């Protein structure tokens, strides 16, 4: 699997047909941004792809002097992402950076989004990234962490695999040329349970976290840094 030009071309339709609840989570990210993005601060869209989460945050910022930093290590994604974000006017500028989220600093951040990105790192790298995000968020800041989950209960995992299978069938996933290769990707991805995600978030320092969305085997957590945090 590579996030190449072909993937960047079909990405919005690929993700729509394969991630149950994706558009709801994009909407939820924007709603959160209205309440959590602070004046004069930064928001990070980590593994931004074509910038869908970036643009949903950006439409919901009504403060001056914010900036969104959208980062992805796929050159094809970045090229399309920069052009795509340039198509829409807003007062908040976006820095679209080709780079690795394992390396980038998190500074003066009121919000950070990992919208189906952490799953692409090696499992052993996940904690360091979440630790870095917690440290770089300002007090009162929020992280949104959306993932495909695994399930400890194998019978429940099977049911949710089947539901995902039926969802893809209902949405004509197999019409897409990329669908076999995407399925091959998902078959080798290493996903964590909700409990595992909550534990890492706690370990990184987040004083409050919770699952705020789920649909079958996909979902999203929101984690808040306390307003009185050190």
Ligand X SMILES: Nc1ncnc2c1ncn2[C@@H]1O[C@H](C[S@+](CC[C@H]([NH3+])C(=O)[O-])CC(=O)[O-])[C@@H](O)[C@H]1O
> For ligand X, which residue has the nearest CB?
47
Nearer to a second copy, 120 or 212 (CB): 212
The interface partner of residue 211, options being ligand X, a second copy, none and the CB cut-off 5 to 8 Å by kind, is a second copy
Residues lying near ligand X in the complex (CB under 6 A) are found at 3, 47-49, 52-53, 71-74, 77, 100-102, 115-117, 120-121
204 close to 224: Cβ distance less than 8 angstroms: no
17 close to 168: Cβ distance less than 8 angstroms: yes
What's the token pair of residue 160? Answer: 């949710």
Task: Report, in Å, the least distance between residue 117 CB and ligand X.
Answer: 4
What's the token pair of residue 61? Answer: 């910022």
Kindly report the backbone phi and psi dihedral angles of residue 69, in degrees, each rounded to the nearest multiple of 5, phi listed first: -115, 115
34 interacts with a second copy by CB under 8 A: yes
211 close to 224: Cβ distance less than 8 angstroms: no
224 interacts with a second copy by CB under 8 A: yes
126 close to 29: Cβ distance less than 8 angstroms: no
Task: Report, in Å, the least distance between residue 208 CB and a second copy.
Answer: 5
Distances (CA, A) of 190 to 124, 134, 193, 214: 11, 23, 10, 18
Binding site for a second copy (CB under 8 A): 21, 24, 28, 31-32, 34-35, 151, 153, 155-156, 159-160, 162-163, 166-167, 170, 207-216, 219, 222, 224
């Amino acid at each position: 699997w590579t996030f190449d030009e072909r993937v960047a071309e079909v990405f919005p339709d690929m993700i729509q047909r394969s991630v149950p609840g994706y558009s709801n989570i994009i909407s939820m990210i924007g709603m959160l941004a209205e309440r959590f993005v602070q004046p004069g601060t930064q928001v990070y869209d980590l593994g931004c792809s074509l910038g869908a989460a970036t643009l949903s945050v950006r439409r919901n910022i009504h403060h001056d002097n914010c900036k969104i930093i959208a980062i992805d290590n796929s050159p094809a994604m970045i090229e399309r992402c920069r052009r795509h974000i340039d198509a829409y006017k807003a007062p908040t500028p976006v820095d679209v950076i080709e780079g690795d989220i394992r390396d980038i600093a998190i500074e003066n951040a009121s919000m950070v989004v990992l919208n189906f990105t952490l799953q692409f790192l090696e499992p052993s790298e996940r904690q360091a990234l979440l630790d870095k995000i917690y440290q770089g968020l300002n007090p009162g800041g929020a992280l949104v962490l959306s993932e495909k989950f695994s399930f400890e209960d194998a019978k429940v995992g099977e049911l949710l695999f089947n539901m995902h299978h039926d969802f893809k069938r209902a949405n004509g996933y197999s019409e897409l040329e990329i669908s076999q290769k995407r399925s091959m990707l998902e078959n080798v991805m290493l996903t964590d349970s909700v409990e595992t995600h909550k534990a890492r978030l706690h370990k990184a320092g987040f004083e409050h976290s919770e699952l705020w969305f789920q649909c079958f085997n996909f979902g999203s957590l929101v984690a808040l840094k306390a307003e009185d945090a050190a």
